[PDB]
């Protein structure tokens, strides 16, 4: 059943050991030099049919002809749909979100700081001063 | 009202937590597939292992009645490990959920009996295997409280060191095979403790001349060591 | 802690609640809420433990194991819970 | 001095756990003496 | 009617899964587990920031908790686990500041 | 079934490997130096070792050599019966008892502080829940 | 199915969390309570595991024998044929006889088939095999006559095999009414007690 | 060596657990017969000092906690259990050298003392008879 | 290619892990640390000064010396926040949302 | 010592003996009866068991413990000499220290016993090891000092070993007290028990 | 670890033993007249045998040959599926239950007549001696 | 042959006690854990119809 | 166990119960004068008269 990553491998994975990937982005194709455009702000007018499909599903699992599955896939798209009105509030209201909301910055600015050299861990303090000494 | 709405995203997104979700439930989002950890490694019995032992490969026996059917180890693994990480590497001499040798005993006295000749131990029947980070914890622990009892030690490595071959090893659940690996870091740090008493109370010994034929051949260097 | 402690206190605090009004409610019934809260929670923790445990062990395992295999390692804690406050509250 | 059900080298020999026996030879001894060739044996 | 439990349930479930793709070389099934990482919490959002600022006994007990649930350190380069970890640090914290955590087996 | 056994593996000799023993080798005969050397040692008054002395100076108990018919068969005995000591109190542990089941700090202590902090935090998250189910309840 | 083990520490704890007090009444009744509701859930254990390996045991009894298609005293199969049927109801309920319609051969073969039937059924341990093997003797010696003059001399042997079957039937009859009875009032002292459990759950104390 | 022979030293685990197990049923059918007794006597006296009188008709030490033995003890040229840390080569030792016309020592390996093995290979073990100046076979 | 890794060679491991995507702080693996004696601890030292146990449970207090906390989270806390901005409006970056600010940090941790 | 096993028939009964009528209403108490005193002998049988075991077991650590020559918290060893008991008492009971009589090098002497002594006592599990080792510790570095300027220095150490050593015999006497309890309401249950016991006997019907 | 093995004992000739073999016995080769027989009886109509019958007569209940590639190679097979009989009543028996020990019909009868009656016999001694007691005590 | 095997007629009389054992412990360990999970539910329900 | 042909041959019968493995030894080497040849002495050297100590006291 498995799918071999060397499938010649007395010879592919000498000639050609597969690396280790790489899952912060896809790093095959161009980085973006500005940021995403600030979606149109959501309300409750576009919950409709969700709403209703899930007071359908809901109805007919009281039947009992419906299903589990599908109440949680509808519910969770109705308060997907909700969840996206409540983060806007949050971020237009709450002030800590307006610097991270207009936060521009470069790939220049990027490389030329020098906060990479405080990231180093710290060290855990001595067992002694659980008995104070 | 249903039951964990918000509580399964790996159903609702098509996540799989293992192989072995991704390939049950088909959502094939493991590009290398699934080996199946077969039944003999996913559990069994504890079982005799020297060669010099009569019932060697055999389960181990026990007061209780206990299923004789044995974890066996992964003795030809395949040449591609991808996840080589102690999760995925304990399994081939561990079962992760611990042997299926364990007791319910219908009394107290029995218990008390068994535990008092020495054939149970909750520690090593009712347990599963110990993760790394549970491992690293312990370890780091133990170094921290050997470093403060006393720092100009020369052995304390060394104790450390079997320390964490017997945590690796899963001592609580098979004593005796990680003894057996952790003895060598036992007789290293009863060198050490010579080495220091003899250092630190100063012990020598009259060395006797060169022999005359120390060098085996004239042109050969003679190394000088302490 | 016992059950039926816990009953007393949510039993004083419906009563309360209702000497109080629904507007001064949450002003003034705040220790006898906490009594209730806790001992719900002594409740909940005898009596779904276990599964609680069971749960986080199959977290440290990756869920690995066979007893973690499906969904009944969540389903059992929650429906513990489901009971308890069922038992509980009403 | 950590793990004493786990080392059974460092451990008493089972004579010792017995209550019962010019001079006399010693009530405790380990099996970590099995890790010296001269313990028992003399050096003659 | 029971989102905070379910959702850190989830939560908990997504970092096990991130955890078993990085050791099995899965990038498709690590980067939907991040993304089905409930990013969309406002509580947890709100408190962010909070926890960010917090300082003492809450971040404290904070602490204790994550370290419980997660004591491996994570890469300080990765920022992906830096976020999760940041995430459930706010969702500990949101819990702990409605209802604070009692870690002691002594108690009464 | 041991005793007066059988040959089990042959015997053999590979073609032209060595022996290195001659024809009078039978006639051969060992010897030490030893004994010789412990008579003049002896007529002589040379240095003795003091392995002839029965009290042990080499460690700080007393050790005492017994002999095994000759001075130079010899083991020390220590002569304390040593006292030794525990800085434990007696009764606080029942190992037989598995205490992961029963309800107590003990058995929060033989798990662990992991696990009673998970415990608490679910604790919480419930006590969430429950909140808002009695205010909804009692704002009807 | 089970669950997974406990969690354990994985740092050593020796003795640092054995109490520094001595206990409070309260503590000490609850550590009762606990005695108590083990000793409930061993009852209810053995109970239960009793009634699960018999209902095991005797469902695969019976299977087995349908599945090797046997016939009892309670004639309960529906695979036989009519005339082993009439045959074996005879043998427990009725009279076995021979008729006058039937050839002195064809008598004789009728009879043999009765003492094999019946000798395949009953054992030596059996009681009524004795009965049962003297009448049909009887039969074998009264071949050539009518059943009038041959009631008249295996009379008193039918007399013993009947009343050695009619013995039978209130054996069994017996036993179904009192392993009935039995079974009940085990039932019943199981609910009672998990009832108890409930309530002492509901008293129950700790955390 | 018959020192170490009374601590069960030579022998293996499965023996060790035999033994155990021998002492543990010993002590259970002495503690059920003497309840048996006991109970016995306290029904017909009617009386509960009786059975309390019985706990004390039968304590030297206790049994051993944990055993070691020979077999525990690692050993192997490229077993991992015995290294430690390298040693050097000019402390290792060197292996006999035979090499003429008519022998050699270094066609096979017989191993070590423990470790042994079949210097011949398989195609010729079958003809081992021919590879001999003598031959001493089994007995059968 | 990744070939077994026997039993002696674990405790090697388990400090010296393989690379993986998603890599530990190996500098910091001696370094994480939990304490399950921290409060049994505790209670034992007040009991023995003298305290009750109520006045130990209100003096408990949870311990510091666990696995240190990421210094990210003080270096780069106004671009987490924002990739956090992003991810909640963005559905988690599905198809690629959150890249840049993903990559601003991703740079200012590595420099090349 | 046991009785022999009970005679058993040497012809074959296989269900001859069996019920041929159902049970009555006595018959059917009786066996409740039986079954009460069943489970009450398995109580007792536990009880008795478990006490003999504990009894056993702990009679034979003791006279190990003696054969050694062993010392605890109490100081309940007669064997002990004047100067180890002193010490000892000292590490348990009062504050360890050197005195300005001695010479330097008998001080150091003095502080390697004592750190021999608790370092053997004590295993690195023990709770009060660090304390005890970072107070000796501090009497190696103020060996060339009195007692009087030591004690400033010193104290902030000898605070937490006392304190540790405290709740170890806070921890004693609570498990003494805890366990004689116990043992009290057990044996109490048990005497209950076996007077339950009598009066069924008494009230048992049947022969 | 049985397959193949090693020789494990030797292989020999004893000293003079014949071996009743030609020189031409490779060339040598078997025969049998069993199938010319069969084909000259087949062509010139000779008896044939009753196996080449699939249904037997040789018992009263149905058999019929079950042939494995020739007439030669077959087995009777039963037909029957037959009826079985028990003249036996059912849950008069607990074998697992001991009998012995219950007071009972079923228990003396588990136990014999033999110990019934010595029973008995002890019941009348007894009796006995407690009417001579009655009769002193009463007299009084 | 072969079938004489699979009834166990080549077997010893330790392997046929041996394979009687690995059965008894296999049905005994099926009966107490679903012993535990029984409990476990009707405990939860509290009802005694769900144990039976 | 008895045969030869058995790999646990005069090895102790295996219980589901804990019972003692000390096993009853017939009389291989008997005496030559055997006074009391009745089936009272002749039983003694192939089985115990009392029976053998593998039995069960069972707790359920
Ligand atoms: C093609 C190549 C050409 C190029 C060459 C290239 C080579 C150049 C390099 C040189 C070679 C170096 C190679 C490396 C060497 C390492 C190998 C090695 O040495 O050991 C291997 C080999 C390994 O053996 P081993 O198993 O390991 O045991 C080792 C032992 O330490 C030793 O074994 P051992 O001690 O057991 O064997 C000794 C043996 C033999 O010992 C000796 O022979 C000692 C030497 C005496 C020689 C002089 C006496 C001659 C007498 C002749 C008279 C006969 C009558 C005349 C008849 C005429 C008609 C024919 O003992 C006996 O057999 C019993 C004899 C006891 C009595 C002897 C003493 C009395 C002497 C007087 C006789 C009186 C008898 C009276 C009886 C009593 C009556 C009352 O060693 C030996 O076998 C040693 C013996 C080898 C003998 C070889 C036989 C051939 C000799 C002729 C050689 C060619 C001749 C050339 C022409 C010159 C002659 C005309
Ligand atoms: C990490 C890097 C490491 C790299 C590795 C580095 C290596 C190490 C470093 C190397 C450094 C460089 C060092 C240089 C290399 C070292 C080599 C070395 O050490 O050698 C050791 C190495 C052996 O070491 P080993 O550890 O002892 O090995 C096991 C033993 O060798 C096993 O012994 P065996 O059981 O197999 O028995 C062998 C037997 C073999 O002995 C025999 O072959 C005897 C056969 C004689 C039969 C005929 C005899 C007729 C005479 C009868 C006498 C009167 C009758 C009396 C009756 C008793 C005597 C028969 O015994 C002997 O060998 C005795 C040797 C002493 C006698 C030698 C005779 C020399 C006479 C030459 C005559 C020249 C005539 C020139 C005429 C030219 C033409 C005009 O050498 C060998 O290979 C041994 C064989 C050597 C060949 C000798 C053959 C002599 C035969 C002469 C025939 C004469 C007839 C001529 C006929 C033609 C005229 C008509
Ligand atoms: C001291 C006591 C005195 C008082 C006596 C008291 C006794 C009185 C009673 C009599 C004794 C009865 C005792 C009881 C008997 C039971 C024991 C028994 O029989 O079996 C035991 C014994 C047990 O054997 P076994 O293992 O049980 O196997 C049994 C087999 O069934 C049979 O074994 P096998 O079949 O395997 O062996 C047969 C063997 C021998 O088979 C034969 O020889 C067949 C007979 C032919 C003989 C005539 C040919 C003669 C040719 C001579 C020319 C040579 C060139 C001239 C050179 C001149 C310079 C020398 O086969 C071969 O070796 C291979 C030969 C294949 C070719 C032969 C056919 C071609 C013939 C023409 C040759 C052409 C060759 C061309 C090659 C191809 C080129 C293209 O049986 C045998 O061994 C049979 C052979 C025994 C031969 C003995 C050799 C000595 C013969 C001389 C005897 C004394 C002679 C007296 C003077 C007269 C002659 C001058
Ligand atoms: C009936 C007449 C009897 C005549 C007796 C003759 C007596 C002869 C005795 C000579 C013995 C000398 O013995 C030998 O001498 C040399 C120095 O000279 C010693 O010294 C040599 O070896 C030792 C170490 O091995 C070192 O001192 C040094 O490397 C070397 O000089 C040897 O250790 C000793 O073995």
Same mark, same amino acid.
């Given at each position: 059943?498995?799918?071999?990553?060397?499938?010649?491998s007395?010879?592919?994975?000498?000639?050609?050991?597969?690396?280790v990937?790489?899952?912060?982005?896809?790093?095959?194709?161009?980085?973006?030099?500005?940021?995403?455009?600030?979606?149109?702000?959501?309300?409750?007018?576009?919950?409709?049919?969700?709403?209703?499909?899930?007071?359908?599903?809901?109805?007919?699992?009281?039947?009992?002809?419906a299903?589990?599955?599908?109440?949680?896939?509808?519910?969770?798209?109705?308060?997907?749909?909700?969840?996206?009105?409540?983060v806007?509030?949050?971020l237009?209201?709450?002030?800590?979100?307006?610097?991270?909301?207009?936060?521009?910055?470069?790939?220049?600015?990027?490389?030329?700081?020098?906060?990479?050299?405080?990231?180093?861990?710290?060290?855990?303090?001595?067992?002694?001063?659980?008995?104070?000494? | 009202?249903?039951?964990?709405?918000?509580?399964?995203?790996?159903?609702?997104?098509?996540?799989?937590?293992?192989?072995?979700?991704?390939?049950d439930?088909?959502?094939?989002?493991?590009?290398?597939?699934?080996?199946?950890?077969?039944?003999?490694?996913?559990?069994?019995?504890?079982?005799?292992?020297?060669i010099?032992?009569?019932?060697?490969?055999?389960?181990?026996?026990?007061?209780?009645?206990?299923?004789?059917?044995?974890?066996?180890?992964?003795?030809?693994?395949?040449?591609?490990?991808?996840?080589?990480?102690?999760?995925?590497?304990?399994?081939?001499?561990?079962?992760?959920?611990?042997?299926?040798?364990?007791?319910?005993?219908?009394?107290?006295?029995?218990?008390?009996?068994?535990?008092?000749?020495?054939?149970?131990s909750?520690?090593?029947?009712?347990?599963?295997?110990?993760?790394?980070?549970?491992?690293?914890?312990?370890?780091?622990?133990?170094?921290?409280?050997?470093?403060?009892?006393?720092?100009?030690?020369?052995?304390?490595?060394?104790?450390?060191?079997?320390?964490?071959?017997?945590?690796?090893?899963?001592?609580?659940?098979?004593?005796?095979?990680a003894?057996?690996?952790?003895?060598?870091?036992?007789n290293?740090?009863?060198?050490?403790?010579?080495?220091?008493?003899?250092?630190?109370?100063?012990?020598?010994?009259?060395?006797?001349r060169?022999?005359?034929?120390?060098?085996?051949?004239?042109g050969?260097?003679?190394?000088?060591?302490? | 802690?016992?059950?039926?402690?816990?009953?007393?206190?949510?039993?004083?605090?419906?009563?309360?609640?209702?000497?109080?009004?629904?507007?001064?409610?949450?002003?003034?019934?705040?220790?006898?809420?906490?009594?209730?809260?806790?001992?719900?929670?002594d409740?909940?923790?005898?009596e779904?433990?276990?599964?609680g445990?069971?749960?986080?062990?199959?977290?440290?395992?990756?869920?690995?194991?066979?007893?973690?295999?499906?969904?009944?390692?969540?389903?059992?804690?929650?429906?513990?819970?489901?009971?308890?406050?069922?038992?509980?509250?009403? | 001095?950590?793990?004493?059900?786990?080392?059974?080298?460092?451990?008493?020999?089972?004579?010792?756990?017995?209550?019962?026996?010019?001079?006399?030879?010693?009530?405790?001894?380990?099996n970590?003496?099995?890790?010296?060739?001269?313990?028992?044996?003399?050096?003659? | 009617?029971?989102?905070?439990?379910?959702?850190?349930?989830?939560?908990?479930?997504?970092?096990?899964?991130?955890?078993?793709?990085?050791?099995?070389?899965?990038?498709?099934?690590?980067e939907?587990?991040?993304?089905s990482?409930?990013?969309?919490?406002?509580?947890?959002?709100?408190?962010?920031?909070?926890?960010?600022?917090?300082?003492?006994?809450?971040?404290?007990?904070?602490?204790?908790?994550?370290?419980?649930?997660?004591?491996?350190?994570?890469?300080?380069?990765?920022?992906?686990?830096?976020?999760?970890?940041?995430?459930?640090?706010?969702?500990?914290?949101?819990?702990?500041?409605?209802?604070?955590?009692?870690?002691?087996?002594?108690?009464? | 079934?041991?005793?007066?056994?059988?040959?089990?593996?042959?015997?053999?000799?590979?073609?032209?490997?060595?022996?290195?023993?001659?024809?009078?080798?039978?006639?051969?005969?060992k010897?030490?130096?030893?004994?010789?050397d412990?008579?003049?040692?002896?007529?002589?008054?040379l240095?003795?070792?003091?392995?002839?002395?029965?009290?042990?100076?080499?460690?700080?108990?007393?050790?005492?050599?017994?002999?095994?018919?000759?001075?130079?068969?010899?083991?020390?005995?220590?002569?304390?019966?040593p006292?030794?000591?525990?800085?434990?109190?007696?009764?606080?542990?029942?190992?037989?008892?598995?205490?992961?089941?029963?309800?107590?700090?003990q058995?929060?202590?033989?798990?662990?502080?992991?696990?009673?902090?998970?415990?608490a935090?679910?604790?919480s998250?419930?006590?969430?829940?429950?909140?808002?189910?009695?205010?909804?309840?009692?704002?009807? | 199915?089970?669950?997974?083990?406990?969690?354990?520490?994985?740092?050593?704890?020796?003795?640092?969390?054995?109490?520094?007090?001595?206990?409070?009444?309260?503590?000490?009744?609850?550590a009762?309570?606990?005695?108590?509701?083990?000793?409930?859930?061993?009852?209810?254990?053995?109970?239960?595991?009793?009634?699960?390996?018999?209902?095991?045991?005797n469902?695969?009894?019976?299977?087995?024998l349908?599945?090797?298609?046997?016939?009892?005293?309670?004639?309960?199969?529906?695979?036989?044929?009519?005339?082993?049927?009439?045959?074996?109801?005879?043998?427990?309920?009725?009279?076995?006889?021979?008729?006058?319609?039937?050839?002195?051969?064809?008598?004789?073969?009728?009879?043999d088939?009765?003492?094999?039937?019946?000798?395949?059924?009953?054992?030596?341990?059996?009681?009524?095999?004795?009965?049962?093997?003297?009448?049909?003797?009887?039969?074998?010696?009264?071949?050539?006559?009518?059943?009038?003059?041959?009631?008249?001399?295996?009379?008193?042997?039918?007399?013993?095999?009947?009343?050695?079957?009619?013995?039978?039937?209130?054996?069994?009859?017996?036993?179904?009414?009192?392993?009935?009875?039995?079974?009940?009032?085990?039932?019943?002292?199981?609910?009672?007690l998990?009832?108890?459990?409930?309530?002492l759950?509901?008293?129950?104390?700790?955390? | 060596?018959?020192? &170490?022979?009374?601590?069960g030293?030579?022998?293996? !685990?499965?023996?060790?657990? *035999? =033994?155990?197990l021998? /002492?543990?049923?010993? &002590?259970?059918?002495?503690?059920?017969?003497?309840? !048996?007794?006991?109970?016995? *006597? =306290?029904?017909?006296? /009617?009386?509960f000092?009786?059975?309390?009188?019985?706990?004390?008709?039968?304590?030297?030490?206790?049994?051993?906690?944990?055993?070691?033995?020979?077999?525990?003890?690692?050993?192997?040229?490229?077993?991992?259990?015995?290294?430690?840390?390298?040693?050097?080569?000019?402390?290792?030792?060197?292996?006999?050298?035979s090499?003429?016309?008519?022998?050699?020592?270094?066609?096979?390996?017989?191993?070590?003392?423990?470790?042994?093995?079949?210097?011949?290979?398989?195609?010729?073990?079958?003809?081992?008879?021919?590879?001999?100046?003598?031959?001493?076979?089994?007995?059968? | 290619?990744?070939?077994?890794?026997?039993?002696?060679?674990?405790?090697?491991?388990?400090?010296?892990?393989?690379?993986?995507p998603?890599?530990?702080?190996?500098?910091?693996?001696?370094?994480?640390?939990?304490?399950?004696?921290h409060?049994?601890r505790?209670?034992?030292?007040?009991?023995?000064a003298?305290?009750?146990?109520?006045?130990?449970?209100?003096?408990?207090?949870?311990?510091?010396?666990?696995?240190?906390?990421?210094?990210?989270?003080?270096l780069?806390?106004?671009?987490?926040?924002?990739?956090?901005?992003?991810?909640?409006?963005?559905?988690?970056?599905?198809?690629?949302?959150?890249?840049?600010?993903?990559?601003?940090?991703?740079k200012?941790?590595?420099?090349?």
């Open positions: 059943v498995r799918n071999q990553r060397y499938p010649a007395p010879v592919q994975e000498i000639f050609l050991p597969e690396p990937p790489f899952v912060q982005f896809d790093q095959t194709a161009p980085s973006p030099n500005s940021p995403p455009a600030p979606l149109p702000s959501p309300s409750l007018s576009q919950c409709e049919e969700q709403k209703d499909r899930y007071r359908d599903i809901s109805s007919m699992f009281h039947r009992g002809v299903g589990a599955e599908q109440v949680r896939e509808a519910y969770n798209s109705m308060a997907k749909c909700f969840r996206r009105v409540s806007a509030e949050v237009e209201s709450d002030p800590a979100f307006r610097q991270a909301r207009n936060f521009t910055m470069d790939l220049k600015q990027a490389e030329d700081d020098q906060r990479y050299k405080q990231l180093q861990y710290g060290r855990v303090p001595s067992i002694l001063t659980k008995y104070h000494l | 009202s249903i039951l964990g709405a918000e509580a399964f995203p790996e159903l609702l997104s098509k996540v799989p937590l293992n192989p072995q979700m991704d390939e439930k088909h959502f094939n989002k493991y590009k290398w597939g699934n080996e199946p950890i077969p039944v003999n490694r996913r559990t069994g019995s504890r079982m005799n292992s020297s010099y032992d009569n019932r060697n490969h055999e389960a181990v026996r026990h007061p209780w009645s206990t299923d004789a059917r044995t974890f066996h180890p992964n003795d030809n693994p395949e040449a591609d490990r991808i996840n080589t990480q102690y999760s995925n590497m304990v399994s081939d001499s561990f079962p992760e959920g611990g042997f299926s040798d364990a007791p319910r005993f219908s009394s107290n006295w029995e218990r008390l009996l068994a535990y008092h000749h020495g054939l149970y909750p520690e090593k029947f009712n347990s599963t295997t110990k993760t790394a980070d549970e491992i690293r914890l312990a370890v780091n622990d133990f170094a921290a409280k050997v470093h403060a009892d006393d720092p100009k030690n020369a052995c304390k490595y060394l104790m450390i060191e079997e320390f964490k071959c017997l945590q690796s090893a899963q001592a609580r659940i098979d004593p005796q095979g003894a057996t690996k952790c003895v060598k870091w036992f290293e740090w009863r060198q050490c403790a010579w080495d220091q008493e003899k250092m630190v109370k100063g012990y020598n010994y009259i060395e006797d060169r022999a005359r034929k120390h060098k085996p051949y004239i050969a260097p003679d190394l000088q060591y302490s | 802690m016992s059950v039926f402690e816990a009953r007393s206190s949510f039993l004083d605090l419906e009563q309360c609640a209702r000497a109080a009004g629904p507007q001064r409610w949450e002003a003034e019934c705040q220790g006898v809420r906490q009594r209730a809260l806790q001992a719900a929670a409740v909940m923790s005898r779904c433990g276990a599964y445990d069971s749960f986080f062990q199959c977290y440290r395992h990756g869920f690995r194991l066979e007893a973690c295999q499906g969904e009944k390692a969540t389903m059992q804690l929650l429906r513990c819970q489901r009971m308890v406050a069922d038992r509980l509250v009403p | 001095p950590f793990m004493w059900r786990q080392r059974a080298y460092c451990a008493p020999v089972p004579s010792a756990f017995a209550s019962q026996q010019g001079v006399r030879k010693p009530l405790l001894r380990s970590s003496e099995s890790l010296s060739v001269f313990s028992q044996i003399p050096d003659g | 009617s029971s989102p905070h439990m379910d959702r850190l349930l989830g939560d908990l479930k997504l970092l096990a899964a991130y955890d078993s793709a990085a050791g099995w070389q899965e990038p498709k099934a690590m939907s587990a991040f993304q990482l409930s990013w969309d919490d406002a509580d947890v959002l709100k408190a962010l920031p909070q926890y960010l600022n917090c300082r003492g006994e809450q971040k404290r007990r904070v602490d204790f908790a994550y370290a419980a649930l997660c004591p491996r350190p994570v890469d300080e380069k990765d920022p992906k686990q830096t976020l999760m970890s940041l995430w459930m640090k706010a969702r500990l914290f949101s819990y702990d500041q409605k209802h604070p955590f009692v870690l002691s087996p002594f108690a009464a | 079934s041991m005793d007066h056994g059988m040959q089990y593996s042959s015997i053999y000799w590979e073609t032209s490997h060595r022996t290195y023993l001659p024809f009078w080798a039978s006639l051969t005969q010897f030490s130096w030893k004994i010789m412990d008579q003049i040692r002896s007529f002589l008054r240095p003795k070792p003091v392995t002839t002395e029965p009290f042990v100076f080499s460690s700080g108990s007393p050790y005492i050599r017994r002999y095994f018919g000759d001075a130079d068969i010899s083991v020390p005995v220590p002569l304390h019966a006292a030794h000591f525990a800085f434990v109190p007696t009764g606080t542990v029942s190992p037989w008892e598995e205490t992961g089941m029963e309800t107590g700090p058995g929060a202590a033989a798990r662990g502080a992991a696990a009673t902090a998970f415990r935090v679910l604790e998250a419930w006590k969430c829940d429950i909140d808002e189910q009695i205010k909804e309840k009692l704002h009807s | 199915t089970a669950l997974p083990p406990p969690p354990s520490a994985n740092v050593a704890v020796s003795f640092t969390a054995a109490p520094a007090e001595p206990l409070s009444r309260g503590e000490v009744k609850a009762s309570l606990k005695l108590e509701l083990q000793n409930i859930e061993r009852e209810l254990k053995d109970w239960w595991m009793s009634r699960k390996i018999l209902r095991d045991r469902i695969g009894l019976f299977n087995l349908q599945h090797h298609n046997f016939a009892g005293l309670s004639v309960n199969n529906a695979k036989l044929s009519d005339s082993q049927r009439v045959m074996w109801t005879d043998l427990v309920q009725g009279k076995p006889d021979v008729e006058d319609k039937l050839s002195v051969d064809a008598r004789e073969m009728k009879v088939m009765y003492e094999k039937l019946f000798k395949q059924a009953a054992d030596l341990e059996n009681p009524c095999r004795m009965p049962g093997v003297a009448y049909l003797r009887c039969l074998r010696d009264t071949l050539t006559e009518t059943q009038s003059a041959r009631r008249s001399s295996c009379l008193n042997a039918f007399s013993s095999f009947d009343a050695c079957r009619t013995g039978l039937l209130k054996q069994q009859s017996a036993a179904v009414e009192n392993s009935l009875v039995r079974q009940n009032m085990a039932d019943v002292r199981a609910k009672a998990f009832e108890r459990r409930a309530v759950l509901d008293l129950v104390e700790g955390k | 060596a018959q020192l &170490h022979a009374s601590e030293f030579w022998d293996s !685990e499965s023996e060790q657990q *035999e =033994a155990r021998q /002492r543990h049923a010993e &002590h259970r059918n002495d503690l059920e017969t003497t309840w !048996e007794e006991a109970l016995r *006597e =306290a029904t017909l006296a /009617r009386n000092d009786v059975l309390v009188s019985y706990l004390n008709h039968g304590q030297n030490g206790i049994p051993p906690s944990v055993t070691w033995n020979f077999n525990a003890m690692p050993y192997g040229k490229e077993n991992p259990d015995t290294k430690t840390f390298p040693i050097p080569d000019h402390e290792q030792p060197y292996r006999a050298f090499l003429g016309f008519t022998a050699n020592n270094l066609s096979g390996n017989w191993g070590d003392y423990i470790d042994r093995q079949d210097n011949k290979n398989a195609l010729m073990r079958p003809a081992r008879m021919m590879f001999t100046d003598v031959f001493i076979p089994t007995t059968k | 290619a990744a070939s077994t890794i026997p039993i002696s060679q674990w405790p090697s491991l388990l400090y010296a892990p393989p690379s993986s998603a890599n530990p702080a190996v500098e910091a693996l001696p370094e994480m640390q939990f304490d399950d004696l409060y049994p505790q209670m034992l030292l007040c009991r023995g003298g305290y009750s146990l109520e006045q130990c449970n209100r003096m408990a207090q949870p311990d510091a010396r666990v696995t240190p906390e990421n210094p990210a989270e003080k780069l806390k106004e671009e987490a926040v924002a990739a956090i901005a992003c991810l909640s409006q963005r559905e988690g970056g599905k198809d690629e949302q959150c890249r840049y600010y993903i990559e601003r940090m991703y200012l941790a590595n420099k090349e």
